[PDB]
Amino acid sequence: AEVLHLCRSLEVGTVMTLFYSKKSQRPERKTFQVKLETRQITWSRGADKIEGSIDIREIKEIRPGKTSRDFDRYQEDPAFRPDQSHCFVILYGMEFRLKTLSLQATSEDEVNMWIKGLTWLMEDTLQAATPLQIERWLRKQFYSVDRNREDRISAKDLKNMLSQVNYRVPNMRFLRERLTDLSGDITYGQFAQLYRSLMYSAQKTMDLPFLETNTLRTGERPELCQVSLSEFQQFLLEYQGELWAVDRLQVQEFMLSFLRDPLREIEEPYFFLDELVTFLFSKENSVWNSQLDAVCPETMNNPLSHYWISSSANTYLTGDQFSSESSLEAYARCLRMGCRCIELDCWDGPDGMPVIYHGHTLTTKIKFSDVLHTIKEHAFVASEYPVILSIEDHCSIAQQRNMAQHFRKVLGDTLLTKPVDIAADGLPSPNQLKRKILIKHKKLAEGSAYEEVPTSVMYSENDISNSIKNGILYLEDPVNHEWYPHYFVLTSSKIYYSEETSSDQELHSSEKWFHGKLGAGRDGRHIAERLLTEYCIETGAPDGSFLVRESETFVGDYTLSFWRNGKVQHCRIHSRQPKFFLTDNLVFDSLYDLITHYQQVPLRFEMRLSEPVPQTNAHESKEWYHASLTRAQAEHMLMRVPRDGAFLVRKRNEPNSYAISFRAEGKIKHCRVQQEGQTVMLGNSEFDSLVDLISYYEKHPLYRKMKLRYPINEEALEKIGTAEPDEPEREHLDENSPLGDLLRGVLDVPACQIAIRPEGKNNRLFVFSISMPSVAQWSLDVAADSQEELQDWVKKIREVAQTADARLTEGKMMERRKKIALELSELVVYCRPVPFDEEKIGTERACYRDMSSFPETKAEKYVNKAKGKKFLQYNRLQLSRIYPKGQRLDSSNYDPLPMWICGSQLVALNFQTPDKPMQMNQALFMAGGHCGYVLQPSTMRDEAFDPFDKSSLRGLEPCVICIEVLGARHLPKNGRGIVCPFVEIEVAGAEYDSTKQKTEFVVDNGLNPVWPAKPFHFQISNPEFAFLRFVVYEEDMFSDQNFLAQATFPVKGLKTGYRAVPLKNNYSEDLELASLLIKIDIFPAK
């Protein structure tokens, strides 16, 4: 069909030029291909050596051109200059930040072919059929663990692969023994057949009212008995309630659509029992009614003040508000996900063009024309409804004319200049503002010059902006004395220092086969087999094994040994300064390559060595070890140190059990790790060696967010810099602080005296240590990286000591600020901020155009029993923007449900933060396919509704919902251990409906678990506004609740009967094959 030809042609491959993301790597030439078996894009180092490839499913957008970071980085040097019609970039990822791949071709036709083929492949693979998706998943999981396509995987490989997909295998020789190698141990067909057999057998305990009633359960393992068409014809009418099942033709079409098989297409379609059970979970059985995913033009004709428009704040950023970078990719992603309100913060630019960055903060600056271009490029790709640009300006006034001119010229007709209806008493409906962009700014008053009227912004409370001077200075480490970075802010009379912030953007010895020292002469000869012969008893070396290490009889050489025909030969490697070579063998530049070379050529005198062997006695030599150690001493050393995170390992009396003692929140915790032969485990998780365990946990969390960081030994305590030795000011809480939760201490400048230290500081040279003469034994040494900064900080601090506070009021009342320009202020026609007056609510003196802004703090004083009712009448006619308080330096969001129910529309969030409010915001907009606009229910638009009074609901029909979860399938992994999942259900809404109920937790099963029956009853008084949320938590060995997957749905558009619930991730991105099965019943008016 003129497309398969294109796909197969693309399968051939082509030679592209890759521009690496990292600056160090030079642009290079590679070979690219598309694999249609698993729908992958694969590039190879050479002709057929693949380097990792990517999945077509994750492709989020394809853009032709060179607008990417790598090209701009390399655009300077005139050696790899790109061309506007010979390069493109691929965007992929499942997070807010999208990874990019920058490619260059040789001709335009080649690029056109590639882009068209990839677009079509992505479109086809997106909406596939469940059996096809399962087949592709099997193919990927099989080949990925198969370096070649020979389709050969051993028993150990199958066991490990099963262990890697959240399913333990305690049944030795589990289930079946079809062949058991009685060359390919498990072919693809055998793999798929066994997969379906297991997925059916392990999930047979769930009892259904119709599946097992068809004279089934006789005992046949394959259960060839196929469900007839008529039984489905009746069932779909009985339980599911699909009226479409009345006609046989529609049912038959459904059968064919789900099946997608030609051989069975021509004879009375049927389902086998396994296929039926799999169909239960399929998206075709999804509880969410896909019919609602469209956008109804009827529900887009109300005044704009009613819709719960999306929003975001601090878009240019991509992380914490203090040191995160700024990029246009954030703007693109936010506009794509379905946002309609974004904020711009402008500052004076060196060349007359502003730069967008956070005021008085270490935020990387970006240009303005580039931001405008990105806005124009990604404005109406995901919708056709207006977007509002709120501008925060701090620039000059000539910069204001420049901004206005650039905006007009670039945006052309898309920018508003006239109002749709001057005489209209309400904001025009969204349909009237299709393909438009609104501009929001402080606006100029009816007078002249800078003017807002009150100017009395009396908040003026501590923050990153209203400070004497901020910056990043290092602090010493009492244990090992490393100058980690910290955040310093100089306030009027106090300073604040935060917790460490690490947030940012040999080979032969480390080799597994490298055993290190073994003995001295004869011991090495005999000990060599002592660590191998006793090891191979586990499984047995296939065609022998090998071991190599430093040679004993030959100093400066390595001895090579290998088991062969009941003999362990001894060899030597001649290391001559540098081309290492064996006896009468080709030279090799390194030992690592010397051994590897033998593993490629088929040395089968030529011996080919098998897989290497891991080592065990590697933890003993390390410092963090104690052969003998009792509890009391354990916690004594653990509490001796002043920092939290210290860890150590100790022996335990019963064999093969060790303990890890660590510190957290000023408390001791002990974790028991068991050992068995060639395995270790603190729980369901499995690790090869204790050294491997610590290394994995040295860079990954173990308990809560703590990370093993300080290895503790008597020497470390002896060299301890200071731990409250010989009253300090560590302090706690102090919530009302500039640094929100990041605060770690406080100090008062007036009582401090400053003395510079132009002396031999440890590896530092810019020090202005602070001393406390009032209380002896205090020295707050602070380092820096330049001479000028040290002087600037010191001078500012000294002024504080003799400041002699004389400011008129708290944080000043502001003064001549920007001299607002006419050009920039002329554009705004809607959404012009003004002060908030309570008396105007409900009167004839309030205009619909004006809005107001709340930093969640003056807002939390309106969402209450006394003010909720009055505040509700305000959002009916006017808008109201709510943004997070300045104290939140982690970008943490806030629960907006009270704000939404109260009627506020533009509830801005922080998209970069994957937290519960963001998930709720994403879920709420499902009604419309993320079009960005959702209409308010009819109940909230009545004169008697009250957000905090059940009886006020009047004549709304209540609802009673009965839920019973049967089981899960394909739960994602978390860390290394096997998840012990429990699914908790929650109803969210008003304060008088919110509730949560949790089930029990299954042990060591996450691939297909089923829970004991326990019907759940829920009651809702306001079905129109509610949210049903399933969260699959895991019960770790520390009795804590971690996050695996979530699924939130509005209650309005839900089906009945037996249903499947697809899962997602914390970022609201669909998972693959993960879902739940439930029985749901609704009893309206009962």
Ligand SMILES: [Ca+2]
């Ligand atoms: Ca701002």
